[PDB]
């Protein structure tokens, strides 16, 4: 029944513009407001503004007027939001939501806009072996650092799939238009060095690396 189904370009260069759509279904488009909201990950929600599809009237958040422009096409019951002159501060997930004038009830799924000047870049995968001597008790923790890649995602696997216990893959952070990810694997002291551990890293947008933690 009621669905706001979003869709709108997601990797963009700074200074460009991106138009994100929100096709509504399961209810009469014309009777409700479409509200748009921005979320910068690890953070809260900001209300951008709304449109009334019946009249085409809008109200914007002072902060976003000029940046966001809101538009509806009542023949297809699809609403749009164009962001302009993008900067990094604009990389967030944007949501349209159906609502009445003052508040929204049912939200669309989100559209992630990532602003970066990068080209497709194969990662540099780096082995992170234990510092030296004066360390380990029952366990030794090894790590894989994979950096400078664009776009997301990568697959990091430890010994081609088994060695599921003890690993933590941290979420990738964008820093200076490329991403870095890292993974720890903790194993028992009679397992490493003796039994070799490799980290396997794959990047759909390019090709695969398999790196052994020696020493």
């Amino acid at each position: 029944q009621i669905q706001l189904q979003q869709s709108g370009p997601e990797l963009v260069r700074p200074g460009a513009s991106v138009k994100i759509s929100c096709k509504a279904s399961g209810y009469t488009f014309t009777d409700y407001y479409i509200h748009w909201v921005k979320q910068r990950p690890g953070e809260g929600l900001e209300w951008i503004g709304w449109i009334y599809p019946g009249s085409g009237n809008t109200k914007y958040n002072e902060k976003f007027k000029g940046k966001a422009t809101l538009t509806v096409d009542t023949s297809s019951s699809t609403a749009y939001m164009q962001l302009s002159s993008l900067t990094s501060e604009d990389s967030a997930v944007y949501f349209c939501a159906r609502g009445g004038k003052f508040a929204m009830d049912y939200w669309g799924q989100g559209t992630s806009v990532t602003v970066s000047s990068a080209k497709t870049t194969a990662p540099s995968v780096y082995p992170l072996a234990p510092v030296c001597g004066d360390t380990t008790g029952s366990s030794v923790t090894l790590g894989c650092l994979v950096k400078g890649y664009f776009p997301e995602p990568v697959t990091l696997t430890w010994n081609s799939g088994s060695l599921s216990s003890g690993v933590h893959t941290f979420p990738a952070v964008l820093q200076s238009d490329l991403y870095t990810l890292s993974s720890s694997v903790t194993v028992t002291s009679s397992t490493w060095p003796s039994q070799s551990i490799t980290c396997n890293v794959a990047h759909p947008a390019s090709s695969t690396k398999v790196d052994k933690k020696i020493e």
Binding site: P127, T135, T180
Partner: protein, 215 residues
């Protein structure tokens, strides 16, 4: 803009517990028409917010009767009476009475757990990286509880602010602990300009900083 403050910002709960979150506005949300436009939404870790309470106390349709909103003017309260695993996520209150509409900061409900001190492990740059020209020192602070940890890099006794990237895992599925990764990036002939690199962490479990270091 009206400010909305939510309390707590993190609420550990054993399943089956009662739980209360609160939302305070910097001014009354009673509107001229008598209605108070205070809404509460739940964002579950990988998706869009879902509506729960409309105009201070009315539940939306399929919201379980366990949820209850209360409050007036500027102080409002959400309460969950017998929390369930499907209720874990972030809670936000929303005021639609004043333009621009504003959300509260969020309150994450999480599973209570015993305190666990972190496992800190520092990693010098790899031969591989230094040959390529860069130097990333990586510090992994694995498996602790509560989430509040404060980590700092001090290279040769100076606290370095610039160049560290941090990443956190969600609360662990079968463990309830947290993990963090902190990476410090320098250039080879810059890393070569100093020698002790320290990664000290402060956490509830220890009155002394947890210090890992090398030369």
């Amino acid at each position: 803009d009206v400010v909305m403050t939510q309390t707590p910002l993190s609420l550990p709960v054993s399943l089956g517990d009662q739980a209360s979150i609160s939302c305070r506005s910097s001014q009354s949300l009673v509107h001229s028409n008598g209605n108070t436009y205070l809404y509460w939404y739940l964002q579950k870790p990988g998706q869009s917010p879902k509506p729960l309470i409309y105009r201070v106390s009315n539940r939306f349709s399929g919201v379980p009767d366990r949820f209850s909103g209360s409050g007036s003017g500027t102080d409002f309260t959400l309460k969950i009476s017998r929390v369930e695993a499907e209720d874990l996520g972030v809670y936000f209150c929303f005021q639609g009475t004043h333009v621009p509409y504003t959300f509260g900061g969020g309150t994450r409900l999480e599973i209570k757990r015993a305190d666990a001190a972190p496992t800190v492990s520092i990693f010098p740059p790899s031969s591989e990286q230094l040959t390529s020209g860069g130097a990333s020192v990586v510090c992994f602070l694995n498996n602790f509880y509560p989430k509040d940890i404060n980590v700092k890099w001090k290279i040769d006794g100076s606290e370095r602010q610039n160049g560290v990237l941090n990443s956190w895992t969600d609360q662990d599925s079968k463990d309830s602990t947290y993990s963090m990764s902190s990476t410090l990036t320098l250039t080879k002939d810059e890393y070569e300009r100093h020698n002790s690199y320290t990664c000290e962490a402060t956490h509830k479990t220890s009155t002394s900083p947890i210090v890992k270091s090398f030369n």
